[PDB]
From a paper:
ERGIC-53 transports certain subsets of newly synthesized secretory proteins and membrane proteins from the endoplasmic reticulum to the Golgi apparatus. MCFD2 is a small protein composed of an EF-hand domain with two Ca2+ binding sites, and functions as a binding partner of ERGIC-53 in a Ca2+-dependent manner. From the amino acid sequence, ERGIC-53 is predicted to be a single-pass transmembrane protein that consists of a luminal carbohydrate recognition domain (CRD), a long stalk domain, a transmembrane (TM) helix and a short cytoplasmic tail (CT). Here we present cryo-EM structures of full-length ERGIC-53 in complex with its functional partner MCFD2. These structures reveal that ERGIC-53 exists as a homotetramer, not a homohexamer as previously suggested, and comprises a four-leaf clover-like head and a long stalk composed of three sets of four-helix coiled-coil followed by a transmembrane domain.
The two different structures of the head region suggest its conformational variability. As observed in forms A and B, component Ihead shows a swing movement of the CRDs, in which the CRD dimer between upper and lower protomers shows a side-to-side rotation as a rigid body dimer. The rotation direction of the dimer is nearly parallel to interface-H (side-to-side rotation).
Author numbering:
A (entry chain D), D (entry chain C), G (entry chain H), H (entry chain G): 40 to 102, 108 to 144
B (entry chain B), E (entry chain F): 42 to 312, 324 to 365
C (entry chain A), F (entry chain E): 42 to 367
Write the structure that this text describes.
């Protein structure tokens, strides 16, 4: 549920960047790949993550496994919004995302 | 007022449906086909009825929903049409625009077929219901219409946008008719003052098809909880210092510029149309003319009030 | 030749589907939506694949197939398109127009998207296959095209009709392009001479959608078995006489005319019945764009009217202020 | 399977003719009743019944009952075509229908 | 002023050419193809030059010519272009827009190709000539241009109309750009004051084609002699009584109505398109918007002068 | 097969016409305008008929004809269209595409107007005639159509190329529709098998214009005589040796590369040369209509700017009048 | 040259009216057919004849003969304009045409 | 008729090469002169002269003289093709051109 290790993963963002980006780097900074993760999952194009974008970021199939229940996803997203969001806008900004 | 985006009562693309074939936090029933980029509530077949409702109920007194939709037809006449519901319970099936009759709440109807015969369709009709009344299907609910409007929302070049705001016991419906791709381009359609609705209810959308046939696609649905500026409670001592925020944001912007440079260099490294661009330019020019005339109207209002104040001296 | 209507390999409205929501004697898979009047093999959403195949195998050496369909799009480009198959096995799902590749039989592809880039599509392509030859999806099967026929079958006012006749090892495809309500207006499209197809196989229809989106509806599908012109047993013993035929057809005609007369006075007896036009459910894409452009000019007219009213009001206010000074 | 009592039923065709023709007069002649039965089930216009029209004429959705299986329906229609159709055209004409 | 239509110096359809293949009272030379409904002065082939001039010379001091033409090209660049001449003698051949250089008179040039490179083409250039000067072909005659204008007259939906008026030693060029089918819809383009031209001369038109190629069609050419209202001489005692004129005209109108009835009855007795009608409606709506804004400008000028007069008190 | 270029039955640019204004070895009649680069067989005026025919008769049993042409119109409908003939006599003038009726030979008609009303044109129709059969002008020759091929050849960015091959009594018509600058991109259009044509006849091209108007230009016309694949006399005695061939082709290549190098430094030596683009001389009819509609909106913008300037002026005047009062 | 007998011709206006009008009258008044002649030759559609329209009306081929010289046509049209036209507009109106 | 003195003429090809190449140096080699003659008259690009290119190469419009008749031109080109062309392709190649 948006763990520090899940965000700080060098290969998940590399797998996302395939096709759109043809630049396989050797090794990147944890903050660099975290910024890449933040930019990748903002589908709407507004630099403002919300609950739906986080739900897409957490429960996408990749490449078999049982999907997570809706209650667990609701609890995880509610916890993320409660902990990280501070302006109570319903959106997660990178200023609010910098904590984790 | 202040708006908080509620994810539990909203859906949008481009990942609208998951691998299970169900919209997250929503339940669809009928002929609705939830796709990955839109929900086809009722396709262009004969006698189609579809509904998509929230699984959980809402818990806010002032709210606002932004609904993006398309109603595309093979002909110049339409089906029964669309409806956006704030009800007390999920009907999910019925003869009123694909949803149940005898509801308790508000329903904004987008009617495409003129059953009454007054040549006043397609139209937007706000209908409230305390729980016990039958919707006059053959008269477009003209008797029960708390308010009414008249906009054409079919076969437009761009998606039609609707903003429905329940604030201070007043319901306001503002519609971007779909001639411009701008998201915030709403124009006033209808308003009901001093209307009482249940304090908790289900948000839903539904669409129905009759003798003719239109495709009723819903591209997005976003629900915002509205709180008054006076009622907004401040919660300090939780945010980080503004200097740290600026230090974060400057390198955020620098790194997004670097990302844009990388994207461009490896889009050019690794290998619209005429007429469509011309049509887009035509519609942009029409929108520019409309905006310039609106500015002229504002300037005329300014000189009008200036002359009134000069006369009042 | 002589043609016999084979009902077990055919479907047709206006009662296409039963109470179970399935086409009788046919099996549908994918995103196909069978309705009571047509089968929407692939709807107008992104990446839709649909197929309807015969449950039982056909054993006619000389056959005729009449397919009535519509391919309707909001734009000027289709997405993937349609396919009529006479295979030996049911493809179900796959990348070849919503059906599996490496088929053993004949397949008539109604391609509406030009993958190769020669701007020759939409076109009807007759392709035969033995089982091991693949189909080049990105080249529209131009190398394997036994017979191509450049016909535009999208967004027509009337349903497009196709007649595929396999007779004496000749496959003739004749297409009514759907400009007239007349059913029997088949114009020549293509012909393949001396083609060998499997002796027994399944009939099928399939459709697919890609990046763009079209509605691929099939209103009817009629299969006729054709017998040899001279190798037909007459068997006149079952026929009774011409006297009973003469005693029956004229009372049938009398019943028809009496029913017409008995229906006419009550058709106008209840005037609550309402009708709809026919031209209003057809408009070309360019005509629709021009009508949208004309529709977008009403806002400018209304705003100019508001400006004129406000300017007249300020002019009258200025005149009344001048009068007040004097 | 196209029984003599099935075609000679007043209530069935009275239910069908409701709405389209508002003339319930009295008991009808058997030949008139059979003519109405033949004309009402030809949903196209060709004065020619076939297998699909017969399948619609057998498995009604009238106002419960289990749907007839495919095999029994196929056997019934094949028997009707074998007994009544004589020109082997695949259609049943009124001259062919009047025998049974 | 008063206008008298001179038939000897005019041509128009729909019977422009006679059986002899020659335009009456006009002489054509070059690649000009006089047809029955227009004159193609220079077709869309490479290096085409054509001229059509009057056989006789004009004998009026104040005049006016209305020229209807089309310049249609396969591309967005044009040929050398058109020219309307009032000269002293028929050149009929030459390198200046298909007509002779070193002329004595006035020439209104419709240039479609920018030889100078100032991105000021297509344009309308009035050039006078006393008899001895060379037209700067590679600079569009910018140095010799008495006046200039800038209108686009190529590939318009409707024919482009031009009115050139020589009145009181002033030459005025007004152009209907061709967005409306109205004949009298001219807009001001250019004006030259105190210009002297020969008292008698030939009226001509010419067109030339270069590396690219446009079709230069002339649909009509009407020449009106203009006389001053003060100089207009009255000639009474020749006309018939006004009562007889009314008696004639009432039955003229009655008989033309009867003719219309007969035409309709035997058009229905004896036995445009979608999109084209839609385009015509689009252009009509644009013209309506333009006319309404012009009316608003007139009203604003009215209130402006009213406020100025009020201030002057 | 082996193909030999017959110059006496051909014409090309960029010197198509001599100083006398006539096409060498060809005779032109009607409203045909021969230019130095193309022959405008029928210009874009009303009721134009034009023909260019070979002066001498051809005597090839197996031949090939390559025709490069453009049919350009200001609208979406053509007028009458083009025709390529291999007759026995010169038609000159007549009602059949600007040439006389009742011809004895083959005629490939490029029809751009739908006279019959089935909305199947533009189309290419192969019609043979023996001398007594008329041509139905008001039915597009549908009854006499030996082979029809629905191809749109009007308003294309590149010239349309047609290859008509009469070989072994088979007439194959293959058409490059003119979407690419590549010359050798011939796609199949139609084929007539076992057709008898006169043993010797005149080649010809003709065009006609009706109520509407198209420009019918022919840029080139190439006639090749085809010999039998095996019935070709080798005659190797006239060939000298491969040694002289090797002494010649390499000095030809050396001359070519030396000329390129000797031209490159003076191509940039004089920078007064100017060039033109290629896409700018092509625009679709619907795209042109939309561009005209967009062009018509500039007047509204200019008038609104004038209105805004005048309203600002009157606002400043009102403010200065208020200041003057105070 | 616009003689009284030339204007008063039933068969000429009948030949002009073929195809556009399918009403062959038996006999018409001289003023009736004169009005028909005036309405027929106004090609522009303004009820105002001029020199060019008269030139078309005089020298059209019908159904061979040497065409009239330009000088004779100029003289005839100038005479018609001098005699009939009174407002000096250059146009011939039916009020001015009623004299002949 | 493609004479040896005609191809071996400096003034002719000097007139042709004016404008396209601004390099008049000196007297050229006969083989270079012949190569320039062959290359300048192939108005298309195929390195292949034919009858039409030869007809243009014979009847110049240089700066008078009567135009050559069709029969003499036909005879000249037919003689050139009969003598020089050896593969019977209808074209004249540089190997075929170098013989004469
Ligand atoms: Ca976002
Ligand atoms: Ca936030
Ligand atoms: Ca309704
Ligand atoms: Ca209504
Ligand atoms: Ca394809
Ligand atoms: Ca293709
Ligand atoms: Ca039937
Ligand atoms: Ca039968
Ligand atoms: Ca110029
Ligand atoms: Ca310039
Ligand atoms: Ca035709
Ligand atoms: Ca046709
Ligand atoms: Ca007139
Ligand atoms: Ca007058
Ligand atoms: Ca060559
Ligand atoms: Ca050779
Ligand atoms: Zn992932
Ligand atoms: Zn029943
Ligand atoms: Zn006459
Ligand atoms: Zn030379």
């Amino acid at each position: 549920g948006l763990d520090k290790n899940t965000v700080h993963d060098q290969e998940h963002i590399m797998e996302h960047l395939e096709g759109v980006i043809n630049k396989p780097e050797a090794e990147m900074s944890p903050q660099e790949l975290q910024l890449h993760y933040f930019k990748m999952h903002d589908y709407d194009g507004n630099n403002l993550l919300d609950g739906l974008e986080l739900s897409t970021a957490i429960t996408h199939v990749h490449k078999q496994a049982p999907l997570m229940s809706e209650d667990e996803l609701i609890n995880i997203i509610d916890g993320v919004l409660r902990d990280d969001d501070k302006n109570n806008d319903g959106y997660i900004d990178y200023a609010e995302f910098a904590k984790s | 007022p202040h708006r908080r985006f509620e994810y539990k009562y909203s859906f949008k693309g481009p990942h609208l449906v998951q691998s299970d074939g169900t919209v997250p936090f929503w339940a669809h029933a009928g002929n609705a086909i939830p796709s990955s980029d839109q929900i086809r509530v009722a396709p262009s077949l004969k006698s189609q009825r579809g509904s998509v409702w929230t699984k959980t109920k809402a818990a806010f007194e002032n709210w606002e929903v932004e609904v993006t939709f398309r109603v595309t037809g093979r002909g110049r006449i339409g089906a029964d049409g669309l409806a956006i519901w704030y009800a007390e319970n999920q009907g999910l099936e019925g003869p009123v625009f694909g949803s149940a009759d005898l509801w308790n709440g508000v329903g904004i109807f987008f009617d495409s077929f003129d059953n009454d015969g007054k040549k006043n369709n397609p139209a937007i009709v706000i209908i409230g219901n305390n729980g016990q009344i039958h919707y006059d299907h053959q008269n477009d609910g003209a008797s029960q219409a708390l308010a009414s409007c008249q906009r054409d929302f079919r076969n437009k070049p761009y998606p039609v946008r609707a903003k429905i705001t329940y604030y201070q016991n007043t319901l306001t419906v503002m519609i971007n008719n779909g001639f411009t791709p701008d998201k915030n381009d709403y124009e006033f359609c209808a308003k009901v003052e001093n209307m009482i609705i249940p304090a908790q209810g289900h948000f839903g959308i539904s669409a129905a098809t009759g003798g003719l046939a239109d495709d009723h696609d819903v591209l997005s649905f976003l629900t915002f909880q509205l709180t008054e500026p006076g009622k907004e409670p401040p919660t300090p001592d939780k945010e980080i210092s503004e200097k740290e925020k600026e230090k974060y944001q400057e390198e955020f912007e620098h790194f997004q510029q670097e990302l844009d440079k990388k994207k461009e260099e490896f889009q050019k490294g690794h290998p619209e149309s005429v007429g469509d661009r011309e049509l887009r330019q035509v519609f942009e020019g029409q929108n520019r003319i409309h905006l310039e005339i609106k500015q002229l109207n504002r300037q005329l209002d300014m000189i009008l009030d200036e002359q009134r104040r000069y006369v009042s001296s």
